[PDB]
Symmetry: D2
């Protein structure tokens, strides 16, 4: 398998006003990431792609478009998790067929699964597809149990618990860790994470790569200055509405990022558009 | 519309070992509710029916079977909510076509929706189907906003907040409230709820109806004795595994309740089956 | 033993502007509760009395004043719980010496105590004083949620009589009456009195009974008689009052309502905001006009 | 002013079996921290010192003993926060009179205080004592989570120097250094020292530095030098020790580790479990063998 370390943008999807996928806009988002953000890879079908508001067929169309547009230029991970395990297996087979480099899967949600149920879910996706898997996160003993399956590569770490982060890095040194919190990239990199998967790399890739590299070189003061500017931008993005603000910033860079998908507010208000313009002037110009 | 007050069993579904719907077993569960539990209605496609682990087509098949088997014998409510609003509209149209008496819809989950997004979700399902709606639950001001749509009938109240319960009953006296916590039926009925939707009525209907009726007549000590026995049974059901224990209790009554659907543990262990047998002997024989 | 069932006001305390106790005002609050609110007893030294912001000597002074003013006319429970167990024993001995009918103690807080430590705390207060105990449960402030098995362990001590259930979990409330039918439960959420009375609580201990004790007794007694429609009507009016009290500021509003009836309920103690704003006073006068006139 | 940056142990206190202070043992703990742990200073009267279970006079006694033993050899911060603001002012005046370099105070807890009330509490302690203040933030115990704007308001008082960040939110930690670059931050989670040092904290205040202060200084200094691999190795060994300490019982295990080095760290104070079990003692000896020998 392809090297999966480094910076991965969690891929946003362009939607039309009626909720359907805007394919031309989706390819422009992808091209922006590969060609201008210079990411190491794309993480497709995650929360950032508005995945859980879509049908199985719509998820497959996004997987097809992303792989067709990215070809073998960068690494591609397909998030195929769901509350429906049969759907996760169907999506995992499809992504595997398309040539995705590995699968990822959120823990089954809506109902409360026990750990045994969560491990059986991941083992089932792996057994039925033949593909390697990135888990989400549970404690050290439970990661150990997950890691008894040799096709589990590591975890997309999205909880800000740096004690567990250190414990995992020590206990399972040959397993990978990708940071999921872009605003805490520096402290995660100080503990040796192997990469980061994030929604803000769709527009702030340049700084994200600088933080990651400066931190691994021990240049912590310089990395912190760039994390500070990054977090001023992230703070404004969160206050204005995360998904809509990143799309509006992409629109100012000539990327047809389109609308959000309903039940999320689909169209940005004038105020939201105004705030996006100010953010672009201050942090991305 | 049909009277929707009273006792509604949240319908469990019978699955085969491979996860597919066992239609004969599903009809036996339905017949048990109508003919022996003597419920006022069935609440189909909710959490209890393992709905969120299923495909759109599987949800439609369950709606078809339940309406075919129940005909017009009792009231039928169809839960059609989802994170995918287009799926909720598709399911709401189908249930409306089949003749369901009203729709219900969980608040969109997985992502964090704002109140405006939640209200637009409910208004969209109503506008696209033409059917009345039962919401889930937010505070008094937000229920008021939901209740500006005249086709919203009331709420399936699943949070144990009896202060909000009283406030809602006072503020919106012509809207209905169904209790969602079977173990707190007495206190809910003391505040005048119009009915209850619950998973334990699939086997404990008799006592549920007695509690509801004794409480409305002011016979609180007698209602409490029956709530105590009910809660001894519920306590054992929860400890042993809710969905699997109710199915195992149904099996002891000659109802082919089958397996649970994966990612939930599909098969009951011997210990779980043993505990179910003890529960049946102590509380349902 | 002196009956501890029924309607108990959680005694409010009158403070001077500098934070010291206003004894004359405290006595007026006590008299208002006994003579006008017609309470069965007073719960003294609880959260409502602003207890946790005071010194040990101030807590002793409030115990002394309350017992000297109430004398033997009503039942009196003394809340003596603290994070300092030595203080709790000192206060429990003092309240016992004064003649309080029973002690009560909040679960030790701040630190995350184990169940054996909580049980040892209760057992120590009882052993050192010789007095009976009511467990004071208030999860919203403490963060401590004890289950049914744990109450069982506390109840192995025969001097633990029951619990002040300042919580809204009515599944746990029912489980308690099922498991330990001979043990007492006092409801702590005034806005949920009807549903708690439907489950057989033996009484209620509340801050709003300092001004709304007439309606509170009615809800309790009507619910016990099975007159739910009548009880719910009075619970509805009561909760319109409580909703306004909570939005305007609980402590300061109840004290301003008492002031309007001629009770010198004084200031609140710092670090709480000690004086109401003009807007808070105006809203309290409207609540009095609408609900207590 | 006396430099307050660097490595501070959160002073543990030695108690006798009956709960009274063991002055000789307390002095031995102080000496161990200064002479062996090589700390920059001591944080006295915090959660680790079992402060919240003590009387006001006991807290004063610990302040007196710690200052008499440490004298002027190291920096000394006095935590004087309480739910009773009058007590906090009394303790702050006493610690100021003794010569403590700075005061610190936990956010008022138990009751749900408003932000204006919290700010008034800090402003009152400062005004009545004339001493500088460190805000003590410990959300896991208090339930109080202040945001960036609120820290801004507290920092309008020039005598508020910074915050003891006993929390793991590193987004908020970064936002604090961005907004208020001239204000100090001390990390409070010993197991997360490396990532906090990566974000520029000015020091650390920790309970485990009573026994692991040599490694704690190394992690801090190596991270500041950008030697991440070396720092992470020492953080890894440190966290194996901390993981065992937490599983065996934090307070009793650190006291037993101190006892094995000849420091009479004594018992814990009730309502905490005062004595370790045989199994706890045996596990503490193994932790000493593996990590502190």
């Amino acid at each position: 398998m392809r090297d999966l370390k480094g910076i991965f943008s969690a891929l946003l999807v362009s939607f039309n006003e009626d909720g359907t996928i805007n394919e031309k806009g989706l390819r422009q988002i992808i091209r922006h990431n590969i060609d201008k953000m210079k990411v190491d890879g794309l993480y497709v079908g995650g929360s950032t792609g508005e995945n859980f508001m879509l049908s199985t067929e719509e998820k497959k169309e996004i997987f097809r478009i992303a792989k067709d547009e990215a070809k073998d230029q960068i690494a591609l991970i397909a998030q195929v998790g769901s509350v429906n395990l049969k759907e996760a297996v169907e999506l995992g087979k499809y992504a595997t067929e398309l040539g995705y480099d590995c699968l990822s899967a959120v823990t089954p949600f809506y109902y409360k699964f026990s750990f045994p149920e969560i491990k059986h879910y991941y083992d089932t996706i792996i057994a039925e597809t033949g593909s390697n898997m990135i888990v989400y996160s549970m404690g050290i003993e439970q990661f150990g149990e997950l890691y008894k399956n040799p096709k589990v590569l590591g975890v997309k770490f999205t909880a800000g618990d740096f004690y567990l982060l250190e414990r995992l890095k020590k206990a399972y040194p040959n397993h990978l860790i990708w940071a999921g919190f872009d605003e805490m990239m520096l402290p995660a990199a100080s503990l040796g994470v192997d990469g980061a998967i994030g929604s803000t790399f769709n527009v702030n890739g340049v700084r994200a790569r600088q933080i990651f590299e400066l931190t691994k070189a021990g240049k912590l003061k310089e990395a912190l200055e760039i994390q500070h500017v990054t977090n001023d931008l992230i703070e404004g993005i969160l206050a204005n509405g995360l998904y809509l603000t990143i799309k509006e910033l992409l629109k100012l860079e000539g990327v047809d990022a389109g609308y959000c998908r309903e039940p999320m507010t689909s169209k940005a208000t004038a105020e939201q558009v105004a705030k996006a313009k100010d953010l672009k002037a201050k942090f991305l110009s």
